Paper text:
Voltage-gated potassium channels (Kvs) conduct potassium ions in response to changes in membrane voltage. Kvs 10–12 have three intracellular domains: an N-terminal Per-ARNT-Sim domain (PAS), a C-terminal C-linker domain, and a C-terminal cyclic nucleotide binding homology domain (CNBHD). In addition to voltage-dependent gating, Eag1 is also gated by the calcium sensor calmodulin (CaM). CaM binds to Eag1 only in the presence of calcium and holds the pore closed even during membrane depolarization.
Numbering used by the authors:
A (entry chain C), B (entry chain A): 14 to 201, 214 to 242, 247 to 273, 284 to 304, 324 to 406, 412 to 696, 706 to 720
The structure:
C-alpha cells in the first residue's frame, strides 16, 4: 500500500502543502490539504486543476523573476525554496515560503511535485496596496503568520534576530521535510514455523524427560539437555524480537515472560514442567486445522499418560519406605508388582526388586489402563494415597476420553455432512421423480444431469461465490470467465474495458449435455449465444440445417430488430457444449450505454444462424414424390382465398 | 454423444472440408471449417445455405461437365474425387481437389455429404484471365497451394514427378479420410462389482488366515490357499486391463502394482499381510454409503482383534522360551493361562500345556477385552514386552472405539435430523397457533393440512427441485406434470410444443383439502383453473349452483375480457382435489406470444363456470313466501330513485 499522503501529513505538523502533477503541462494541482485551503482562503475544488505554480495567487507586486524561477525549478525537477508576495481570495498581499520537492518513483520517474507553504509577511516587510492603518495591516500580518510564528517560533518572541534564528529554523524544518519527501508514491515467516516446530518437539522432549528425571532420576542425555536449555533461551530472545519492537517486548513481559524465564534457567526441576507454556504458541496455530487436533489430543493423551505414570511411580516409591521403621507393609503396587514379575525385595540393607525399565513401562501400562477406561487390574491401587490418586486419574481419564470421542465425532460429522447433503438432495430428487411417475428415460436424464453437475461443480454455488467477492473483483472474475469469448471474437476486440466488465457481468454460462436442446422450435429467442466449446445441430422440420462449432454465434440480432421472435428451429447439442449466453435485456442495456461501441458491435458480429429467419427448402423425398406424380397426370371458394393470399 | 465434427477435424490435419445436407434439394451447406473459410476467402454465414456443389464458386473457365459429374455423385450418393478450376471471393482461378463422401447413418440413411478440398493450381497448370506477370501469377499459385505443398509434399521439392508421387499421396490421404468417414452422424460393470466382492471376502480370508498361520502355523486349506493365489493373480491382470489400456497399465504400475505384486507371489508370508491393498479399491466404493461404514468399522474391528490376538500369542510364545536355559519364568499369560484352565507344562523334553484352539480363542478374548475397553483381567499382561504391547493395543483400542462411537453418532444424527426438522416446524406451528389463540377448529385445520402435506410431499420443495434442473429439463418435467391437462383438454391439442412448455412452466398445482374453498365470493378471479381430480361445489348465496368434476375449467376468460372481476360465488372443494391453475398474467404473456394458438384456444376452451357472471335465480322458499303474500293483499322520494334505476 502507498501511504504517500499519510506520511507527509504526519511529518508536516500543522504545515501545509499542495501536490501537483509533474508529468503534465502547466503542472496542475492534484491535492491541497485543509491548511492550504485555510491559508489560501480557497476551496479544494477551486484549488485543484489550477497550476501548482499558483499563478492565480499572483499579483501586481508578485515578482516575475520568482515566477520564472519557479518555472525553472519545475522544469529541471529541482528541490528549491523561495519567498514571494502572493495574493489570496480576498487579494491580500501575503509573503509565502514555498519549498518545492520533486517526487521520484519506484521507477524513479518524476511523477509528482510537492509545494509546501508558510507566511513570511511579518518576517520580511509589510506592504499594502491599501489598508485602514499601519497597525491594522500589521495586525493582519501577525494574524496571517499565526501557525508560522506560534507553533514553530515558540521562544523566539523573547529573543531578537528572528530572521537569523527562527526563520532559519522553519526553513530547516522544510529541509527535514524534504528529507522526508522519500515516500516517492509507491507501495510501502518460514523460520518462525520451523522454529516453533523444533521447540514443539523439544517441549515434547522435556515433558517426557523431566518427570522421568524426577521419578527415576548417561552423559549424552546431559549434552542434549544443555542443547535444550540454550535453544530455549534463543527462543526467549526470539519471542522478544519477532513480530506479533520494544512494544512487543513489553507485551511479552506482560504476557508470558515470567513463566518462560522461570521455566528454563534442585527440586525446582519440577519448575521445568512449566516449559509447556511454549506449546500455547502453537495451539492457536493449529486450532483452525481440525484433523490435527485429533493428533493433538492423542499426543496430550500420551503425554498425560507419561506424566501420571511418573506420578504413579512417585506414589509407589513414597509409599514403600515412608518411615524409618523400613517396613514393606505388604501393600503397594510396587510390592505386588515385585511379587508378580519375580525377585521380591530382600535385605542383607534392602536389596531392590524390579528393574527400573520394567517399573516404568509397567506404571505406564497402569496409567494407560486408567486413561483408556480398560482397567485390567494387574497393577491396581490398594494404599490410601494411591487410591485418591486413582480417583484423580480416573476423573481425568473420563474427560480425556470424552474429548477424544467428541473430537472424533465432530471429524466424522464434517466428513459426513459434506457428502450427506448431496446424497440427501439426490434422494429427494429420486423421491420426487418416483412420486409423479415420470417416464423412466426422462427421470434417468435428469438424474444423470444431477450427478454430472455434481461431479463437475463438486457442489459449489459459483454465483454465490461471486456474490462473496466485491464489485470490481467479481467483474474481473467474470472477465476471466468470458475470456473464451473476448479473446476469440472480432465483435469484442474494439470494446472498452468498462464495456468488457459490464458485459461479462451479464454472461451466463451453460454446460449443455449432449442430446439436450437449448431452443426448441417455437420457443422465444431472447438470448444470443456464443459457443466456446462443443458441437451443435440446428433442426428445422426434422432436418439438420446448421452445424455450429467452436466460436459461433446464434440466437437473434436484437439491437437491429428490437422485436421478440419465435425460434423457427430446434437447436440441439451434439457434444458436451460450453455456451456463454446473454439475454437481450442486459445486452440492450449495455449497448444503450456504450453507444460508440454498439455500432462496431453491429458491424463486427455476424450471426452464424438467425433463429428468427425461417429458411425455405424442399426435401428430396418431396421431389421424388413430384416425379412420381406424372402417373396422376369447385376451386372458386378456395382460390379466392388464394387470391386473399395474393392480398397477403 | 455424436462427435461427428471432432473426429473429422482430428483426422483432417490442416485439410479443409464442408458438410452439406444430403436429404435437402440443391444440397445446402450446413458447415464449413475455418480452413475452407481461408481457402475460399468467404465467411461462415456467407458460405452456409449455399450449395455444397459450390456453384457460386464457379467461373467462366469452370467445366460444366465436372458440374454435372458433381451433380451425379450427389444424386447417386457416391464417393468420388474431382479437380476443377473454381473462383474465390476475389475471383481467382484456383484448381480444387474435391473429395465427396456420403455420410450414412445408424439408420443407414444418406443424411449428410462431406466435401474436402485442396489447391491443385501449381500441380496442373497456371491459367489467368489477367495478371501482372507470369511470375506474379505463379507466385500467387504457390502461395495458394501452401498447405497442400507444405505439410503434405514435404520432401517432394527435392524429387521430380510430383504428380506421380505427392499428388497421388494427397489423394491417398483423402482416401484414408474417406476410410475415416465412418462416424456416420450417430452417438458413439457387474463383473467388476462381483469380482471386487469375491476378492474382498478373500482379503478378509487372508487377513484372518495369514496371522493365524504365522502364529499357530490339513490339505484342503492348502488347496483353497492356492485358489486364493491364482484368483489374486487374475485380479492383478484385471487391474491391469479394466477401466479407470496401456495408460492405465502405466498408472497401475505407478500407483499400486509393486504392493499388489509383492503381496501375492518363508518368513515373507508376513509380506502377504499387504494383500489388504486390494481393500482400498472397495473403500472408495462404499465411503459414500454411510450405514455400511458402520459395518466396515465392525469388520476392521474384528480383523484388528484377530491381528493383535495373533500378535498376543506371538508375544507369549516369544516370552515363554526366550532362552536356552528353558525356564518357564513363572510369569506369562500363557503360563497363568495354563495354571488357570489346567494342565500346567511338564517335562520328561517339555510337554506343552493348553490346546491351541483354546489358546487362540483365549487370546482373542483378551484382545477383545482390550479393544472393547472392558478389561476383565483373566489374561492380563505382566511381562515387559507384553506390557508395552498392552499400551500399544490400548492406544489402538481407544481410537477404534472412538471411530465406532463417532460413526454411530453421525448415523443417529442423520436419522434424527431428517425427522427433527419436521417435528420442529410442527412444534413451532403449534406454538404460534397457541400464541395468538386461534379458534380450535381453524388450528386443527391448519395442523392437519401440515401433516397431510408432509405425508404426501414427504418434505420435498419440489419447486426448488425444479430449480436444480436446467431450463429444458424443467420445462419437460412441467410438461409431464401437466399431461393431465394437455392430454385431456381440446383446448391444448392444437398447441405447439414450445407453447406447451411455455405454458407448463406457468402452471401451479393445488392440492385442495376437502371442505376448503378456493375462491371466496368477492375474491379476485385472476387464475383460470383446470380440475384434473376431485369434485367441487360452487356456492352462490348459500346454494349449490355448479358441481365441477374431472376435466372442468373454471375461473374467468381473461383474453376476451382483459378485465379483473370479483368472484360472484364461493368455490369449495368436496373431495381431495387436484387443480392445475394458471394466473392471468402468465397466460396473457403466453397468448400474446403464441398468436396463432390463442385464437384456437379461444375457440376451444369452454368455461365450465364463469366466476364473473353472477347468475340470477330465486329460491323456492321465496316463492312460497310470495304465495303466502296473498293474505297481505310516500313512494315519490324513493320511486324516483327507482326512476334513477330506470336511468340506470
Amino acid at each position: 500500500q502507498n501511504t504517500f499522503l499519510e506520511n507527509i501529513v504526519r511529518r508536516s505538523n500543522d504545515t501545509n502543502f499542495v501536490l501537483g502533477n509533474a508529468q503534465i503541462v502547466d503542472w496542475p494541482i492534484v491535492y491541497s490539504n485543509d491548511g492550504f485551503c485555510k491559508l489560501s482562503g480557497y476551496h479544494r475544488a477551486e484549488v485543484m486543476q489550477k497550476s501548482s505554480a499558483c499563478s492565480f495567487m499572483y499579483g501586481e507586486l508578485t515578482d516575475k523573476d520568482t515566477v520564472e524561477k519557479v518555472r525553472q525549478t519545475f522544469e529541471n525537477y529541482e528541490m528549491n525554496s523561495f519567498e514571494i508576495l502572493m495574493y489570496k481570495k480576498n487579494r491580500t498581499p501575503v509573503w509565502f515560503f514555498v519549498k518545492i520537492a520533486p517526487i521520484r518513483n519506484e521507477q524513479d520517474k518524476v511523477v509528482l511535485f510537492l509545494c509546501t507553504f508558510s507566511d513570511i509577511t511579518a518576517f520580511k516587510q509589510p506592504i499594502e496596496d491599501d489598508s485602514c492603518k499601519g497597525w491594522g495591516k500589521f495586525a493582519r500580518l501577525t494574524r496571517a503568520l499565526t501557525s508560522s510564528r506560534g507553533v514553530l517560533q515558540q521562544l523566539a518572541p523573547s529573543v531578537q534576530k528572528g530572521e537569523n534564528v527562527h526563520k532559519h529554523s522553519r526553513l530547516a524544518e522544510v529541509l527535514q521535510l524534504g528529507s522526508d519527501i522519500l515516500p516517492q508514491y509507491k507501495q510501502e515467516c518460514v523460520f518462525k514455523t520451523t522454529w516453533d516446530w523444533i521447540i514443539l518437539i523439544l517441549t515434547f522432549y522435556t515433558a517426557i524427560l523431566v518427570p522421568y528425571n524426577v521419578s527415576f532420576k548417561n552423559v549424552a542425555w546431559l549434552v542434549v539437555d544443555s542443547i535444550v536449555d540454550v535453544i530455549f533461551l534463543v527462543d526467549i530472545v526470539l519471542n522478544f524480537h519477532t513480530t506479533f519492537p520494544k512494544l512487543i517486548r513489553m507485551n511479552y513481559l506482560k504476557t508470558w515472560f515470567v513463566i518462560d524465564l522461570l521455566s528454563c534457567l534442585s527440586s525446582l526441576k519440577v519448575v521445568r514442567l512449566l516449559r509447556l507454556g511454549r506449546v500455547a504458541r502453537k495451539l492457536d496455530h493449529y486450532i483452525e486445522y481440525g484433523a490435527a487436533v485429533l493428533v493433538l489430543l492423542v499426543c496430550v493423551f500420551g503425554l498425560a499418560a507419561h506424566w501420571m505414570a511418573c506420578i504413579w511411580y512417585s506414589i509407589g516409591d513414597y509409599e514403600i519406605f515412608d518411615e524409618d521403621t523400613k517396613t514393606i507393609r505388604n501393600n503397594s503396587w510396587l510390592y505386588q508388582l515385585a511379587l508378580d514379575i519375580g525377585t521380591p525385595y530382600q535385605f542383607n540393607k534392602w536389596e531392590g526388586g524390579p528393574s527400573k525399565n520394567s517399573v516404568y513401562i509397567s506404571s505406564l501400562y497402569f496409567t494407560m489402563t486408567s486413561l483408556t477406561s480398560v482397567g485390567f487390574g494387574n497393577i491396581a491401587p490398594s494404599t490410601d494415597i494411591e487410591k485418591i490418586f486413582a480417583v484423580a486419574i480416573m476423573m481425568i481419564g473420563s474427560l480425556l476420553y470424552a474429548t477424544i470421542f467428541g473430537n472424533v465425532t465432530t471429524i466424522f460429522q464434517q466428513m459426513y455432512a459434506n457428502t450427506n447433503r448431496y446424497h440427501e438432495m439426490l434422494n429427494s430428487v429420486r423421491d420426487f421423480l418416483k412420486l409423479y411417475q415420470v417416464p423412466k428415460g426422462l427421470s434417468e436424464r435428469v438424474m444423470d444431469y444431477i450427478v454430472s453437475t455434481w461431479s463437475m461443480s463438486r457442489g459449489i454455488d459459483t454465483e454465490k461465490v461471486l456474490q462473496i467477492c466485491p464489485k470490481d473483483m467479481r467483474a474481473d472474475i467474470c472477465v476471466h470467465l468470458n475470456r473464451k469469448v473476448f479473446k476469440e471474437h472480432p465483435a469484442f476486440r474494439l470494446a472498452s474495458d468498462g464495456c468488457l466488465r459490464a458485459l461479462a457481468m451479464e454472461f451466463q454460462t451453460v454446460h449443455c449435455a449432449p442430446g439436450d436442446l437449448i431452443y426448441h422450435a417455437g420457443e422465444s429467442v431472447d438470448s444470443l449465444c456464443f459457443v466456446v466449446s462443443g458441437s451443435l445441430e440446428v433442426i428445422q422440420d426434422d432436418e439438420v440445417v446448421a452445424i455450429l462449432g467452436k466460436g459461433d454465434v446464434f440466437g437473434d440480432v436484437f439491437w437491429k430488430e428490437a422485436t421478440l421472435a419465435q425460434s423457427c428451429a430446434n437447436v440441439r447439442a451434439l457434444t458436451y457444449c460450453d455456451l456463454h449466453v446473454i439475454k437481450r435485456d442486459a445486452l440492450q442495456k449495455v449497448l444503450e450505454f456504450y453507444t460508440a461501441f454498439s455500432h462496431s458491435f453491429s458491424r463486427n458480429l455476424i450471426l452464424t444462424y438467425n433463429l428468427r429467419k425461417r429458411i425455405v427448402f424442399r426435401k428430396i423425398s418431396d421431389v421424388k414424390r413430384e416425379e412420381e406424380e406424372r402417373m396422376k397426370r369447385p376451386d372458386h371458394p378456395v382460390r379466392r382465398l388464394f387470391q386473399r393470399f395474393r392480398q397477403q
